[PDB]
Amino acid sequence: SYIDWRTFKGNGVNLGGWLEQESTIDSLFWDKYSGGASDEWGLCEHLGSQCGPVLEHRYATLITKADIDKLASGGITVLRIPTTYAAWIDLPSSQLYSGNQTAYLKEIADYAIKTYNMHIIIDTHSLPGGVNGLTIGEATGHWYWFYNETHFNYSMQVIDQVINFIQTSGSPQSYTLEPINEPADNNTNMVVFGTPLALTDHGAAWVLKYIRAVVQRVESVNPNIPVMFQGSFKYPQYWEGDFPASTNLVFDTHHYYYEHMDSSSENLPEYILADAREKSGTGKFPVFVGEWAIQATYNNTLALRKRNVLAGLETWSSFSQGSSYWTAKFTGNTSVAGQGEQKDYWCYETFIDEGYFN
Amino acid sequence: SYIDWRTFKGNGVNLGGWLEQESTIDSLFWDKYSGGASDEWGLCEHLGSQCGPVLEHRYATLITKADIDKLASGGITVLRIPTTYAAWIDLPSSQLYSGNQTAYLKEIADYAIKTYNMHIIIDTHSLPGGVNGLTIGEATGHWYWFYNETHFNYSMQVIDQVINFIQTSGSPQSYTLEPINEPADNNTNMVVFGTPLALTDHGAAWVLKYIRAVVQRVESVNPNIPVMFQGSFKYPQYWEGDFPASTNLVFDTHHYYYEHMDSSSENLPEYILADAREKSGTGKFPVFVGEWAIQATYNNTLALRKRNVLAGLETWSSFSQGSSYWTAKFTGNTSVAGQGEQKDYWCYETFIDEGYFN
Ligand SMILES: *[C@@H]1O[C@H](CO)[C@@H](O)[C@H](O)[C@H]1NC(C)=O
Ligand SMILES: *[C@@H]1O[C@H](CO)[C@@H](O)[C@H](O)[C@H]1NC(C)=O
Ligand SMILES: *[C@@H]1O[C@H](CO)[C@@H](O)[C@H](O)[C@H]1NC(C)=O
Ligand SMILES: *[C@@H]1O[C@H](CO)[C@@H](O)[C@H](O)[C@H]1NC(C)=O
Ligand SMILES: *[C@@H]1O[C@H](CO)[C@@H](O)[C@H](O)[C@H]1NC(C)=O
Ligand SMILES: *[C@@H]1O[C@H](CO)[C@@H](O)[C@H](O)[C@H]1NC(C)=O
Ligand SMILES: *[C@@H]1O[C@H](CO)[C@@H](O)[C@H](O)[C@H]1NC(C)=O
Ligand SMILES: *[C@@H]1O[C@H](CO)[C@@H](O)[C@H](O)[C@H]1NC(C)=O
Ligand SMILES: *[C@@H]1O[C@H](CO)[C@@H](O)[C@H](O)[C@H]1NC(C)=O
Ligand SMILES: *[C@@H]1O[C@H](CO)[C@@H](O)[C@H](O)[C@H]1NC(C)=O
Structure with a gap:
């Protein structure tokens, strides 16, 4: 049976840093191979024709069936899988590896579906030209996707391949299609990233043109495949009037606490409640918290990690359809404000191994 | 006969633009007398020896007993009265008029107390040296108050004058003392104004030093006079741990909607309820919403003004101790996004005359 996001609930994890690369997730990997680049685009440029061999090794080794077994043992039922657009289309001007x-x-995905009946969200994390001027959108400094009909068409070509992957998978009912991630056209000053000010009405109109095109394409092939819309950092309420209730649509909200607020480990449940209570729409469409983590801006403490993870899970499940943590596997050693490093707050496997879900 | 802000409830108004001047409140005044200045400081400098005569005429004519009778007829029971520090002390280095x-x-105040038993909040809206780089803090570009013992000392001199006014008033039980308004040390980029990022922890420590000194000074003379702490745009929770619950303290929160969010007239009650639910503290101390107004960032409509004012009044008096609207009398004709001008959304006497409170 296909899922109805209005009645489905699940707790998941992202498989971040696996098919798309970022400096913070694995410090040893980045130090060894980036040449100091800020982005996957530059890491691949730096490696030259060794980019493919290095990345294929990481694809084959970072996430294995054993990781899926460990996640299932901790109660995971949803995997969100960020991919670069270059997994789906080979553009000669792209420096991302295909x-x-x-x-x-x-x-x-086959292992998680056939073994555990997990649900899989396929996320095209970057789109051709860049959707937010960050590594995750294509490359640092790239916002060329907006208002560009060539990049629009390439994006639809990418989505035609993701729909076909789902439709021919053997279990099309196991997948949700997420065709964009964190679009932003107003974040030259990163103080507005994570806020509604990251996306202007002009940018939002282009995003809406794209999502409407993706919805029409999915409906033409298989209307039972849900579309997960990551509406930047706008409240879901902002996009509700753009879609009829009959659309097979779920919103993906991202909630973080590690900068730009007076969060602490002590008060983190208050900030999580605020986001759940204020940023989950009116109920017109369902909401899934597709990314979150417990790192606070100030005064991180190790002893409150279990309390904070369990408070977040219960909050997202109470105000929305559930959540997926960023991220399954994280070894980055960037210092946090307070106790420890990012790997102590961002690695979901560590929480499982330390018995947070027993 | 003194009030306990934990039990007291009241709906009020600000008498803004009366004893402190701002360009938006009265366009005819500003256009006639400012010489193009951004601030009261520069308006007074431009007028030179005519500054006093021009301001004394406004003091005598803008707010009269007739205004108090009209406000009382609309159910007003609290007056918040913004003053410049120059009302209280005459510093030889200040261009503000004394x-x-x-x-x-x-x-x-005496008319309001004797006739209607209104409660009076005396607000020192500016302090020597400037508390937020804005006209309201002293002058555009002035942040000199922070970490400066000269300006600290003359601030305490201002507070001594306000305490003496209250104690010699004939009705000290009728007054709350508010010794600062919207301090901000991190608003050189005004995108952060209205948010917690407008005040750094370093600036917040200086504000705390000052509020602790004011609380001690009032406690030393008449501890039954409440102190109203306007803690910038931090959540009240930020400051709660800094005062024992026995302190005769109330927070003043300021909630506005006219920039930096996807607010509309249609959705304004959602934004009002979000502020009340997340920005009212934990209950350790009482909260009063000392400034708010109904102008939204987008799609202002005149038709929803009554619904929006009543929604806000009801919300602030349920989740806190009430509110005071900005402002009693406003003739500024700056355009808003959508229909109308600022005077249609910022003039409380207009709401009374349209029968909103009948
Ligand atoms: C962080 O990881 C990098 C790359 O492995 C390593 O060079 C560095 O010494 C680490 N720092 C600490 C303090 O562990
Ligand atoms: C892709 O996988 C195929 C089949 O397993 C293999 O023959 C080939 O070497 C792989 N290509 C790269 C670029 O690693
Ligand atoms: C759109 O992107 C294509 C491919 O880079 C580029 O050649 C073209 O100049 C851009 N068009 C516009 C409208 O800027
Ligand atoms: C985009 O794709 C459509 C449909 O195949 C085509 O009609 C259109 O001309 C293409 N536009 C560009 C800029 O390539
Ligand atoms: C764009 O971001 C700037 C801050 O860099 C902000 O001042 C401005 O209001 C934003 N514009 C929009 C439409 O969000
Ligand atoms: C605003 O009022 C000023 C001062 O009376 C007047 O000169 C100006 O034309 C008005 N602007 C309008 C009505 O938008
Ligand atoms: C202030 O008020 C007093 C008493 O009515 C009056 O004598 C004086 O002229 C006024 N001062 C100024 C500077 O207008
Ligand atoms: C405080 O700042 C003013 C400038 O606003 C300066 O004149 C004064 O010397 C400073 N005082 C101290 C004690 O630094
Ligand atoms: C502030 O007043 C205190 C107490 O009278 C005095 O000791 C000090 O020197 C004054 N500081 C300045 C900078 O005027
Ligand atoms: C100060 O404001 C800037 C934006 O202009 C913001 O990037 C920065 O994080 C703020 N700092 C603090 C400590 O609030």
Whole structure:
């Protein structure tokens, strides 16, 4: 049976840093291979024709069936899988690597579906030209996707391949299609990132043109495949009037606490409640918290991690359809304000191993 | 006969633009007398020897006993009265005018107390050296108050004058003392104004030093006079741990909607309820919403003004101790996004005359 996001609930994890690369997730990897680049675009440029061999090794080794077993043992029922657009289309001007990403995606998705009946969200984390001027959108400094009909068409070509991957998977009912991640056209000053000010009405109109095109394409092939819309950092309420209630649509909200607020480990449940109570729409469409983590801006403490993770899970499940944590596997050693490093707050496998869900 | 802000409830108004001047409140005044200045400081500098005569005329005519009768007829029971520090002390390095402000304040306050038993909040809206780089803090570009013992000392001199006014008033039980308004040390980029990022922890420590000194000074003379702490745009929770619950303290929160969010006239009650639910503290101390107004960032409509004012009044008096609208009398004709001008959304006497409170 296909899922109805209005009645489905699940707690999940992101498989971040696996098919798309970021400096913070694995410090050893980045130090060894980036040449100091800020982005996956530059890491691949730095490696030159060794970019593919290095990345294929990481694809084959970072996330294996054993990771899926560990996640299932901790009660995970949803995997969100960020991918670069270059897994789906090979554009000669892109510096992102086009390889066997989807073969590893299929191996891990098949195992999670056939073994555990997990639900899989396929996220095209970047789109051609760049959606937010960050590494995750294509490359640092790239916002060329907006208002560009060539990049629009390439984005639809990418989505035609993701729909086909789902439709021919053997279990189309196991997947949700997420065609954009954190679009932003007003974040030259990063103080507005994570806020409604990251996306202007002009940018939002282009995003809406794209999501409407994706919805029409999915409906033309298989209307039972849900579309997960990551509406930047606008409240879901902002987009509600743009879609009829009959659309097979779920919103993906992202909630973080690690900068730009007076959060602490002590008060983190108050900030999580605020986000759940104020940023979950009116109920017109369902909401899933597709990314979050417990790192606070100030005064991180190690002893409140279990309390904070469990408070977040219960909050997202109470005000929305559940959540997926960023991220499954994280070894980055960037210092946090207070106790420890990012790997102590951002690695979901560590929480499982330390018995937070027993 | 003194009030306990934990039990007291009241709906009030600000008498803004009366004893402190701002460009938006009265366009004819500003266009005639400012010479293009951004601030009261520069308006007074431009007028030179005519500054006093021009301001004394406004003091005597803008707010009269007739205004108090109209406000009372609309159910007003609290007056918040913004003053410049120059009402209280005459510093030789200040371009703000020192005249008969407190004589006009006493005529109106005494009338309001004797006739209607209104409660009076005396607000020192500016302090020597400037508390937020804005005209309201002293002058555009002035942040000199922070970490400066000269300005600290003359601030305490201002507070001694306000305490003496209250104690010699003939009704000390009728007054709350508010010794600062919207301090901000991190608003050189005004995108952070209205948010917690407008005040750094370093600036917040200086504000705390000052409020602790004011609380001690009032406790030393008449501990039954409440102190109203306007803690910038931090959540009240930020400051709660800094005072014992026995402190005769109330927080003043300021909630506005006219920039930096996806607010509309249609959705304004959602934004009002979000502020009340998340920005009212934990209950350790009482909260009063000392400034608010109904102008939204987008799609202002005149038709929803009554619904929006009543929604806000009801929300602030349920989740806190009430509110005071900005402002009693407003003729500024700056355009808003949507229909109308600022005078349609910022003039409380207009709401009374349209029968909103009948
Ligand atoms: C962080 O990881 C990098 C790369 O492995 C390593 O060079 C560095 O010494 C680490 N720092 C600490 C303090 O562990
Ligand atoms: C892609 O996978 C195929 C089949 O397993 C393999 O033959 C080939 O070497 C892989 N290509 C790269 C670029 O690693
Ligand atoms: C859109 O992107 C294409 C591919 O880079 C580029 O050649 C073109 O100049 C851009 N068009 C506009 C409208 O800027
Ligand atoms: C985009 O794709 C459509 C449909 O195939 C085509 O009609 C259109 O001309 C293309 N536009 C560009 C800029 O390539
Ligand atoms: C864009 O961001 C700037 C801050 O860099 C902000 O001042 C401005 O209001 C934002 N514009 C929109 C439409 O969000
Ligand atoms: C605003 O009022 C000023 C001062 O009376 C007047 O000169 C100006 O034309 C008005 N602007 C309008 C009505 O928008
Ligand atoms: C202040 O009020 C007093 C008493 O009515 C009056 O004598 C004086 O002229 C006024 N001062 C100024 C500077 O207008
Ligand atoms: C405080 O600041 C003013 C400038 O606003 C300066 O004249 C004064 O010397 C400073 N006082 C101290 C004690 O630094
Ligand atoms: C502030 O007043 C205190 C107490 O009278 C005095 O000791 C000090 O020197 C004054 N500081 C300045 C900078 O005027
Ligand atoms: C100060 O404001 C800037 C934006 O202009 C923001 O980037 C920064 O985080 C703020 N700092 C603090 C300590 O609030």
